[PDB]
Amino acid sequence: MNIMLTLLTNVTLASLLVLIAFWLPQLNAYSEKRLPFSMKFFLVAITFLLFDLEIALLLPLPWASQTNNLKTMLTMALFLLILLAASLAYEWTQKGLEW
Amino acid sequence: MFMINILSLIIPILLAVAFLTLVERKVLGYMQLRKGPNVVGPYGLLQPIADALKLFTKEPLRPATSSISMFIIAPILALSLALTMWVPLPMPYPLINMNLGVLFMLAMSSLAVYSILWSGWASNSKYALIGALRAVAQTISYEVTLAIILLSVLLMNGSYTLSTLITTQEHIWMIFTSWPLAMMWFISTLAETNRAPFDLTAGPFAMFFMAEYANIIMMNAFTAILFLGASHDPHTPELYTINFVLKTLALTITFLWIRASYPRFRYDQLMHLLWKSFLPLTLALCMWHISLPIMTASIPPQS
Amino acid sequence: MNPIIYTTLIMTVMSGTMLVMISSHWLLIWIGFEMNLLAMIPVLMKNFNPRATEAATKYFLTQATASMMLMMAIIINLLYSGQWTITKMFNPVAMTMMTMALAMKLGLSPFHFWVPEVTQGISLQAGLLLLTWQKLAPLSVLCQISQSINPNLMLTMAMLSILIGGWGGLNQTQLRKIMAYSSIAHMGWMTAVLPYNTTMTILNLLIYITMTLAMFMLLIHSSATTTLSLSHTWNKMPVITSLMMVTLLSMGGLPPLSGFMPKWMIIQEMTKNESIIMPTLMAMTALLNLYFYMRLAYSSSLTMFPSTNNMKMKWQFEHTKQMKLLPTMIVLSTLVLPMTPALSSLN
Amino acid sequence: GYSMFAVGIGTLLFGYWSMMKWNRERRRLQIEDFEARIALMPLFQAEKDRRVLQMLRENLEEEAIIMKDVPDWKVGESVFHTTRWVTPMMGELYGLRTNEEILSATYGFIWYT
Amino acid sequence: PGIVELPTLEDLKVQEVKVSSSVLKAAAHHYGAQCDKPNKEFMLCRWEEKDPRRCLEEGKLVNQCALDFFRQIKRHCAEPFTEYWTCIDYSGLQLFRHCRKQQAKFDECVLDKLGWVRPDLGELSKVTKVKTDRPLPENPYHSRARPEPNPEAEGDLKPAKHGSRLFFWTM
Amino acid sequence: AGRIASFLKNAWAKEPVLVASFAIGGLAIILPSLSPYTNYAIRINRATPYNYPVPLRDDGNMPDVPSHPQDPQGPSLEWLKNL
Amino acid sequence: PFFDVQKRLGLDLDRWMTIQSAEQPHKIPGRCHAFEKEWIECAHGIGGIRAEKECKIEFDDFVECLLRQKTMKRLSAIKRQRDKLIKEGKYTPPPHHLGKEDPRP
Amino acid sequence: MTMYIAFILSTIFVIGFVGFSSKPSPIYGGLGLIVSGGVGCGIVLNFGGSFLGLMVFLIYLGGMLVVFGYTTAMATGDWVIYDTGDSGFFSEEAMGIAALYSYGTWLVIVTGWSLLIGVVVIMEITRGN
Amino acid sequence: MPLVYMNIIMAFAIALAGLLMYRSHLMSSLLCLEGMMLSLFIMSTLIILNTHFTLANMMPIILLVFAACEAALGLSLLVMVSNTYGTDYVQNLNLLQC
């Protein structure tokens, strides 16, 4: 409830300020007188998406450290990070990071 | 007495980002062997008021041919995110105490690029669209490293709670435990907020400017809390508040100093810098920080 | 593509199918399907061209929709019974939706429209892999839950598949579309015996895989895509045309060739359950498959079509690359009727 | 060149040692707090059982009063074939209570920030 | 199917412990050390019976024992305990680390008066044994009778009679 | 031996970031299997009481199970205190 | 079809997540642990058909625990009748249900 | 009771799905998708799954729908199902999710391999030729 | 079965209908697929959290990951189509026919 009130207050204040800034100069009358589609941008977007997915996999590490299976958890975390590094390396060597 | 707290957290932030422009002009002027604004008011103190009044009384240059919907939506989202990204912060007691505060900050920072995307799309120009695309790509690329560094550092904290960061650094700053991660985090915050050397690019313009400067102050306060902890005495929080504010101001002055003291990167140069210098080191240091508590039997408590 | 990358993608496709077949969790089965779909796309796009891209995007759209439907069915089944193990579905709506998802994955009618176009756009090698290997995971999943599937839905979809394959095969001229419609009809035949005996389903799957592997390898050997390109083959390698005609006769269900073993056996099983009208209908429908196979045989081997002068130069050069297991595939798809009882091996 | 790397590594090692000691102390404090909670648990369990049973009894009394006119209603009829004790839902306890405590019970922990 | 049985409100009446959470946390260690036997009996009964309605007497016993413990504390060491729980109460997290000094004063006072030794680290979390005369419940799950298993017949394999017997195949 | 040293010297020039990253990653992979404190970390994790310890029913044949928390029987956390 | 590699090798690749009552972390119990345990023990080594026919009581209780349809129906009926009576005016709620009660710890 | 806040959020979710399901001007359908995703995250957070809701709000909105918008621009009744007891001194959702590394070794292996193969597949497809 | 689950399944059905309608703009088809995925995530999360099936909390995250990967794949294909035609209208994919 408190966070909902905070978000509503923030949005309301921002909207009110924007509209008053937009309408204060509007009271006074005045004169009132493609193809390229670069592939590199799409490639960097896709790379960001995939690395974001791997980061999502990596996120629960702070709570994963208390399991009594420290060897298995450590092996799995290092496996995930090694796969992330290997994906980056494959993208690097095959000229996937060129402008 | 909750709305009072929200207003007392919102209005001072806006005043701070109002006077940050004056402080930045003065600092750059004195670094460039001149004086900043010192005619309007005693020492330029009335300059932000004059700038705001001039901006709000100037006619807006609405394209009259674009999508007015997204054109008016984008500043709303930018300012709303900039203001709502302050509530988890403990100084020293957060306004809203959340278990997963850091993830909330990361999520809002990730959402921040929608304003850039929509402003570029609604600008109705191919050049503006290209600029927006470059800005979006840079922001997301650097936010990847932001997230990785954040989780790697929090591995020594115990959880995602922001308040616990005060307890972790009670005896020693986190700057000494991991300085390389801190330096890469500082550069990532510089590049995320579009600041030199990474700044390739009436009403809504002022809206965007306030959002950007509020993001600057937020990022610097977050870095101060995360890496430069202050002693917290429960019976007198004013000491912690003073220390935290001083560290935030020092980091902001460092931001202005860095802007004034360096040339700017190219787009491809900064993309290369990230993808080929920060990300490999970030992965290596994340592995090191995963393995370190198990090596030294110093796993943080909370779970 | 690089040979190492191609080998890795093929291993990933096989690993996804294996994960689907050897897993006892619905989530792991869905993961296996996703891995199969993810690695299968570049195999279609090995020879880059607009037709391959369009076929690949059609295949991706259909498979993604099927996977989403399958996941929704899994979610509903979990909701109405907190079980993840692949067993009795415990819900009618979940079973119906999962049946539609597996029909989309398999290609049974009326979800059959994508098969002819995807087969036509993509190459012969890609088509061969898609036609035989892809069927193994959905068929295994259907066999694992055959005790819960509604006989009405499966039987009507199988009948519609047989009818549609038989009718659509008559019109086509390109060989790849003929193979697509043949696959549709064979799967209509094969899924009709799922509620009764899954061993017959597996036996029909094995026989069909052998026959279509042999026919696709023969089509690759004599690089023919349209009917006339196949008619030109007799002037260079008559043995290939003769073997192809024998395999085509086998694929039509003519005894004593191997292709008669499944149909016959399948009919027998549906006669044990007092189902008489349907096997008769499917036999008279498979007569249409026989008809267009016979037309292809007339065009290819039993008559000598006009040749071309330049073909003389092709007389001097031999096939540099020989594909192993082609003679074995032909023999297994033509002369294994006398060993029919070996189906008791629960193959 | 060597001196800068040596200084950096020395700072890293000092920070690691200090954090090791502090984190071990935090582990000990956490164990102490958990032991205090463990010592306090049985009283809380007893009070919770008593409160749940009292709420169920009050709901049963109200059901007996209200359902008096419904013809085929059996007051306090279980919906499970087994006779084993089954933990009641939130609605089984706060079904007939006022709305504010319904909201408190269902949403207070989530909404408390 | 069936009628649930619930104890009358007179069966749930007991002298409640009317102290706040901080007061309970201040004396949690000594309460656990001294009042251990009724607490352990109640908790074992709760875990074995799997039914709140079969453990009312142990709940009343633990309430009474806690009241006796707090009455002793009030009689002997009221003021140091008051200071200690006030300090514990002030903090938001109610941390023991904040005011070890007041805790030391309270511990020494209660060791002087009642001779109580504060349990060390790793002692209140031990698993213990309880000697009780309550009979072990024979079927706490109220389960039915398990259905009879399949015959699972056995024997020596013999060759199939007349082979496969599949149509005309004689082998 | 000489070729490997020459290659490492070459990589340490004009590419120090990759060398540092690989060295740190290799150290993080290798070291935990050699450190003697990892078993201490496992024991510390095991010693944290998250759930209520349910007492066992006494039958007269449990000498290793203490009857009171103060009793000497049972696991002790003196090793943790000394750390 | 189903090549049971796990049971052949005893690997336990994916069997721990199949059911609610199988070794949860920190021994956190499922909401319907008891009912699922009862049904599983009823239907083990019996076969699909016999388990469906004979252990229907346990499965019905399990589904009732999972979805609580009958409990919702009963509570809705009670609430509707109480609303009708309070509309006619023959029923008044006690202080306990009006917030005027004496709360207990 | 808050006018069935779960029901209000579910209805707003359905309204957003209807709005973006008509597929008008794919950028506007995207905007409807962000609205629906925000409402769904609100539902999940209200239910009690804070980590999963924040997971949606971070991954889905920040990365995946952002990539969607990037590519587009480049071109032309309740409250009764709940529990009764407590979770102890931890959050059950966080423990279950963090059990991915100690229990779900198979899941981690297959997901990592799938992601690596996805990288390879994307490079192969976008290579061109 | 409460109204929340009914509304979620209704949302999934609406998204499926939108995907199958196919007016134009294959990007809209991908958006409909991802709306279906989001509905699946919400429903699975609610079901798993309601029953305290702790070990199943892994399932949504995993799901999301895989689904997002598919989305990426789909986008790639879309791009190629545009690079061959200049635009992503669905009616342009008519070279292959039954």
Ligand SMILES: CCCCCCCCCCCCCCCCC[C@@H](O)O[C@H](CO[C@H](O)CCCCCCCCCCCCCCC)COP(=O)(O)OCC[N+](C)(C)C
């Ligand atoms: C043309 C006809 C098809 C031919 C197919 C190719 C022939 C070559 C294949 C080489 C051997 C195949 C298998 C390799 C042996 C080891 C694998 C073995 O362990 O698998 C066993 C099983 O063995 C195979 O199933 C038998 C393979 C034999 C296939 C031939 C039967 C064809 C019948 C009609 C044609 C007669 C033969 C013609 C010449 C080959 C385990 O069975 P099980 O895990 O417990 O049950 C799983 C099935 N369920 C789930 C339905 C219950």
Ligand SMILES: CCCCCCCCCCCCCCCCC[C@@H](O)O[C@H](CO[C@H](O)CCCCCCCCCCCCCCC)COP(=O)(O)OCC[N+](C)(C)C
């Ligand atoms: C066995 C066959 C080997 C050859 C064939 C390989 C086929 C494909 C490769 C994938 C199969 C690998 C098998 C791994 C199965 C995981 C389960 C098993 O390993 O036990 C685990 C043991 O963990 C091991 O550390 C697994 C490490 C293996 C992962 C490292 C390398 C994996 C590479 C596999 C291919 C992936 C892509 C290629 C990478 C190079 C569980 O540990 P445990 O503590 O008892 O149980 C915890 C649960 N509790 C809490 C109930 C007790």
Ligand SMILES: CCCCCCCC/C=C\CCCCCCCC(=O)O[C@H](COC(=O)CCCCCCC/C=C/CCCCCCCC)COP(=O)(O)OCCN
């Ligand atoms: C015994 C076990 C010990 C464990 C090992 C740990 C030790 C690790 C030792 C090495 C770690 C060092 C990592 C530091 C980060 C490296 C970044 C980097 O290398 O990038 C630079 C580039 O970095 C930059 O130039 C960025 C400049 C951006 C402007 C900022 C100027 C810096 C001045 C500001 C002060 C920084 C403040 C830091 C403290 C912040 C407080 C919170 C190199 O790029 P190039 O020159 O192009 O070379 C690559 C091609 N060969």
Ligand SMILES: CCCCCCCC/C=C\CCCCCCCC(=O)O[C@H](COC(=O)CCCCCCC/C=C/CCCCCCCC)COP(=O)(O)OCCN
């Ligand atoms: C087994 C551990 C693995 C995990 C740890 C590392 C994780 C993350 C780090 C790796 C991320 C991806 C790396 C991708 C590698 C790509 C290599 C490459 O192609 O780069 C070459 C250049 O790189 C090389 O020279 C080859 C590799 C460099 C050295 C590799 C490691 C050397 C040995 C490491 C260990 C050192 C010895 C240990 C000493 C211990 C202390 C005494 C091309 O240069 P460009 O940048 O493209 O050109 C720009 C200028 N025109």
